[PDB]
Amino acid sequence: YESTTMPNQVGIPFKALIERPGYAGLPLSLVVIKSELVPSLVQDYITCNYKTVV
Amino acid sequence: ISSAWSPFDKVIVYRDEVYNEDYAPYGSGQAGRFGDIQSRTVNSTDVYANTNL
Amino acid sequence: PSPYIKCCGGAECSKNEADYKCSVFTGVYPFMWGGAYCFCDTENSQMSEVYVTRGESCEADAIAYQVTASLKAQVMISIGELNQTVDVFVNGDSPARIQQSKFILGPISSAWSPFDKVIVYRDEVYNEDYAPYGSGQAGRFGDIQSRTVNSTDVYANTNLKLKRPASGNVVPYTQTPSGFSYWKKEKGVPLNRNAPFGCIIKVNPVRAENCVYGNIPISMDIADAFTRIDESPSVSLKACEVQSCTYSSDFGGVASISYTSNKVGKCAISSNSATMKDSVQDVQESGALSLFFATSSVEPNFVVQVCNARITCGKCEPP
Amino acid sequence: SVAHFEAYKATRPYIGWCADCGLAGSCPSPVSIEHVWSDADDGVLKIQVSMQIGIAKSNTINHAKIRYMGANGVQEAERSTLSVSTTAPCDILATMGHFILARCRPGSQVEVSLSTDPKLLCRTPFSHKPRFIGNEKSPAPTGHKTRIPCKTYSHQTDLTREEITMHVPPDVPIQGLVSNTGKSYSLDPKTKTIKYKCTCGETVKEGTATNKITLFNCDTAPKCITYAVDNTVWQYNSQYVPRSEVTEVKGKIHVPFPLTDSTCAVSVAPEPQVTYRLGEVEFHFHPMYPTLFSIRSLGKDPSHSQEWIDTPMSKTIQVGAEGVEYVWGNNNPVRLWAQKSSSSSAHGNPISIVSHYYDLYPYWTITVL
């Protein structure tokens, strides 16, 4: 039916074709191009240098 | 996910290169400390800081 | 949308939107009603279509937050000549100057905060956990996921059953209400009475008032020299009268302290071994004072001082 | 579009399928409910219908007139009666063109009807379930005790303010107009321009017809297709309008009545009588029409249960050193402390002991052990 655990290795061609009983064609080949960590941040403060005034 | 991780923590992201720095916010009082200038309104000149003159 | 017909053999949807479902029925309008609008009637096709659009009810109905709270105090400071309270953060060191005497408001040790994974409807803040990326599906909170409020495209899940016509009338279809509409009724349970040990969470300020937790270290360098002595009357005839004794303990202490003095001056009394009404206080000869207390139930014992001299009370406890 | 005049002209009105034509009988009705949407907590129904109210056919404004188009083409009609009815009467909040605002009662179906000159009605299932805001009502409700937040669809009409799309090039529904009379084909134009594509025909077999012709060797249906159509028509979907085109074009229409926050005035029941014991508080509920009650805490435990209190009962809820909060109806919370006989001076001792001469809390029963 389904379901494996692949390791995340870039550029490795992983072959899954686990499907229902009976011969099941049209396999999944999957390559990982990149993982992309998409940030979930809270802004604590903004800081930059300053203009001093007399 | 089986497990998830990021090497990020408290970070201060310069445009020169991201750098890993610790700090404690609202803790100004003194002439040191990373990120002594704290500004939150970008429509106002207020900054919380400690400086010496 | 109601049906669009394509004469004598159509093709499937290749219109797209934020979410789409599409079925192509073939051979339709078998007797027609003159809504064929084609030569064909024996081989016509109807491309039936549906799509999602995002409503105007995306105001705060509902927004999922991961909170870690920042700590704010409202301490009231009285130097005995400026009476002000000032809202100020307690994260680590916080120097504040009033008449160029140093105060530092230290950090409060929070046992827990009521703001966690919570859901906020605009009707009312509600305490309710979710699983991340749990919306766009049925059986779990939500049925529609939009990443930001401005995003006009959504991943939505709705059920529609389209059928072909088979009669002299014109289309069969049955349509169920939206998934979000089912959850609108459910809400959560109020975020207004969660967390033990104070914490009243009020919807409009989006914050939690009167939260008693831990100890607050405080440090100050304050100018109280002046000229020392700043007048210390010696004191005699020290007595404790206890009256007005009636059971309960969710209100303050009522003690009266009698003494007699041999000088007029000013002490700062009382300290923390008991609680006075007045902290800037004129101590005079024959000074009987009914005064108010407020620690006499955390610490029923009280060592009341009037300057140097002192005694122990109370005497009223359940017999 | 830009404005009320321009909007209404460019996206011509239209007839749609309505499967109630008398409360039974399925016909093209010129009144057809397109959609009912409710995003108001003021109970308001934004009903979309195919007639256009407050504009005439001459492209001028008369509240007395209304403009609709169906299989007699585009006509003006008089309006002096307009009603909506769930399963029981409704009050119309505001009406502007396509859109109707109404406050109705519960019902399984929603009926848009008139009787002045159209003399028809369309009734379509749309669910509107009970609306009970406050906790009291009264003959001719208007009561106030507490303001509650709500959301609503504006009273004011906007000449432009958001859009919705309309689409598919002119194709105006007909139900049958052509028939084989005798053994020849009699082309009826009626009172509109008719476009037909005919396999055969002696005179006409493609053209815009507005006269009567007889065509021999011709017959209705898969080989002679007639429909009346007139230009500059984008319609919004109905339920069961079929339409075919060879090209794909759109029109737009403006949306009066946007969603906006308000506050409503409602009465809830005044506070029930309280009876007091030594450190404990008891509520005796008075007769009133159902009030939702909360019994909560945040002082010592987070704890909460809810019930509708519909009938007189005494409930004992305990109040410790920390507060206890009772929320009754939609009113703001009352907080209550421990009332025994009031005050303290020194009660209790640092080595823990309990009130009066009881044995409970355990501080006397330890003594027994």
Distance CA C268, CA D7 (A): 80
Mutation target to probe the D interface, by most D beta carbons within 10 A, among C7, C17, C37, C304 is C37
Using DSSP's 3-state secondary structure scheme, residue D134 falls into coil
Q: Say if B6 is an interface residue toward chain A (CB within 8 Å).
A: yes
- DSSP helix, strand, coil percent of chain A (3-state; round to 5): 0, 15, 85
d(Cα C208, Cα C192) in Å, to the nearest integer?
8
Do A47 and B2 make contact, defined as CB atoms within 8 angstroms? Answer: no
CB contact under 8 A, D302 and C171: no
Helix H segments across chain D?
4-10, 365-368
Q: Does any CB of chain B come closer than 8 Å to the CB of residue A1?
A: no
Residues of C in contact with B26 (CB under 8 A): 70, 89, 91-92, 94
Q: Answer for the pair C152, C212: CB distance below 8 angstroms, yes or no.
A: no
Query: Rounded to an integer, what is the distance from CA D342 to the centroid of its chain?
Result: 54
Q: Is C239 helix (H, G, I), strand (E, B) or coil?
A: strand
Q: Is C165 helix (H, G, I), strand (E, B) or coil?
A: coil
Helix, coil or strand: residue C90 = coil
Of residues D259, D302, D356, nearest to C247 (C-beta): D356
Residues of B in contact with C102 (CB under 8 A): none
Structure tokens at C199: 């914490």
Closest CA to C311 of C271, C269, C257, C261: C257
Question: Cβ atoms within 10 A of the Cβ of D327, count?
Answer: 19
Taking contacts as CB-CB distances below 8 angstroms, the residues of chain A near B33 are none
Size of interface B-C (CB pairs under 8 A): 17
Name every residue whose Cβ is closer than 8 Å to that of residue D62 and which is 6 or more positions away in sequence: D54, D55, D56
Cα torsion D78, D83, D84, D85: sign? negative
CA distance C239 to C311: 7
| Interface with chain B: mutation pick from A43, A45, A50, highest number of B CBs within 10 Å | A45
Handedness of CA C114, C118, C119, C120 (dihedral sign): positive
Are A45 and B35 within 8 A, CB to CB?
yes
Q: Does chain B reach chain D with at least 3 CB pairs under 8 Å?
A: no
Q: Which residues in chain A have their CB less than 8 angstroms from residue B47's CB?
A: 50
Instruction: Chain B: give the shortest CA distance to residue C218, in Å.
Output: 15
Strand, coil or helix: what is C179?
helix
Q: Do C249 and D357 touch (CB under 8 A)?
A: no
For tokens 């969710």, name the residue.
C250
Tell me the Ramachandran region of residue C79: left when phi exceeds 0, alpha when psi lies from -120 to 50, beta otherwise: alpha
- What residue in C sits closest to B26 (Cα-Cα)? C91
| Residue in the structure block whose two tokens are 């044995």 | D359
* Closest chain C residue to the Cα of B23, Cα to Cα: C92
Q: B15 touching A, CB under 8 A?
A: no
Q: Is A39 on the interface with B (CB under 8 A)?
A: yes
Longest Cα pair distance anywhere in chain B, in angstroms? 55
Is A7 part of the contact surface with chain B (CB cutoff 8 Å)? no
- Helices vs. strands in chain C: H and E counts, helices first: 1, 25
Angstrom distance (rounded) from CA D137 to CA D156: 27
- What is the least distance, in Å, from the CA of D281 to any CA of chain C? 14
A5 touching chain B per CB within 8 A? yes
Q: Tokens 């064609």 map to which residue?
A: A25
Structure obtained using: cryo-EM
Residue of C nearest to D322 (CA): C250
Chain A residue numbers touching B38 (CB-CB < 8 A): 45, 47
A-B C-beta contacts closer than 8 Å: 25
- Chain C CB contacts of B29 under 8 Å are 93-95
Question: Minimal CA–CA distance to D134: which of D240, D263, D296, D254?
Answer: D263
Residues D338 and C246: their CA atoms lie apart, in Å, by 13
Cα D183 to Cα A15, C32, D220, D222: the distances in Å are 70, 21, 11, 17
Q: Which residues of D touch C195 (CB under 8 A)?
A: 298, 302
Distance CA D117, CA D76 (A): 10
CB-CB under 8 Å, B25 with C91? yes
Please state the separation of Cα C299 from the chain's center in Å.
32
Q: Which of residues 24-53 of B touch A (CB under 8 A)?
A: 25, 35-40, 42, 47, 49
**Residues of B with Cβ-Cβ distance to C93 under 8 angstroms:** 27, 29-30
Q: Subunits that touch chain D (at least 3 Cβ pairs < 8 angstroms)?
A: C
Give the chain B residue whose CA is nearest to the CA of C89: B26
Surface-to-core class of residue D133, CB atoms within 10 Å of its CB (0-12 exposed, 13-18 middle, 19+ buried): middle
C319 Cβ neighbours under 8 A, 6+ residues apart: D357
Contact assignment for C318 to D325 by CB distance below 8 Å: no
d(CA A16, CA D364): 72
Pairing of strands D194-198, D163-167: unpaired
Dihedral through CA D28, CA D30, CA D33, CA D34, nearest 10?
A: 80
- Shortest CA distance from D26: residue in chain C: C169
Return the SS3 of D336.
Answer: strand
Residue B26 forms contact with C (CB below 8 Å):
yes
- For chain C, the chains sharing at least 3 beta-carbon pairs closer than 8 angstroms are B, D
Tokens 């075919």 belong to residue: D244
Instruction: Indicate the SS3 state at residue D8.
Output: helix
Question: Looking at the partner chain, which of C36, C246, C316 has a beta carbon nearest the beta carbon of D342?
Answer: C246
How close, in Å, is residue D92 to chain C by CA atoms? 23
Q: What is the C-alpha to C-alpha distance for residues D101 and D112, in angstroms, rounded to an integer?
A: 11
Q: Which two tokens stand for residue C28?
A: 């339709």
Among C63, C64, C45, C92, CA closest to C216: C92
Question: What residues of C are in contact with residue B27 (Cβ under 8 Å)?
Answer: 91-94
Distance, in angstroms, between D146 CA and closest chain C CA? 15
Stated as kind and residue range, the H or E segment containing D107 is strand D107-113
Could you give the 3-state DSSP secondary structure of residue C183? helix
Contacts of D176 in chain C (CB under 8 A): 33-34
Cα–Cα distance between D313 and C145 in angstroms, integer? 46
C59 touches chain B (CB under 8 A): no
Q: How far is B38 from chain A (nearest CA, A)?
A: 6
Q: How far apart are CA C36 and CA C46, in angstroms?
A: 10
8-state DSSP, A26: S
Contacts of C4 in chain D (CB under 8 A): 168, 243-245
Q: Do B29 and C91 touch (CB under 8 A)?
A: no
Q: Are C266 and C230 in contact (CB under 8 A)?
A: yes
Phi, psi of D324, deg, nearest 5: -130, 140
In the numeric block, which tokens belong to residue D294?
Answer: 């909360």
Which is nearest to C230 in space by CA: C178, C282, C171, C290? C282
User: Which of A44, A48, A49, A51 to mutate to probe the B interface, most B CBs <10 Å?
Assistant: A44
Name the phi and psi angles at C175, rounded to 5. -135, 125
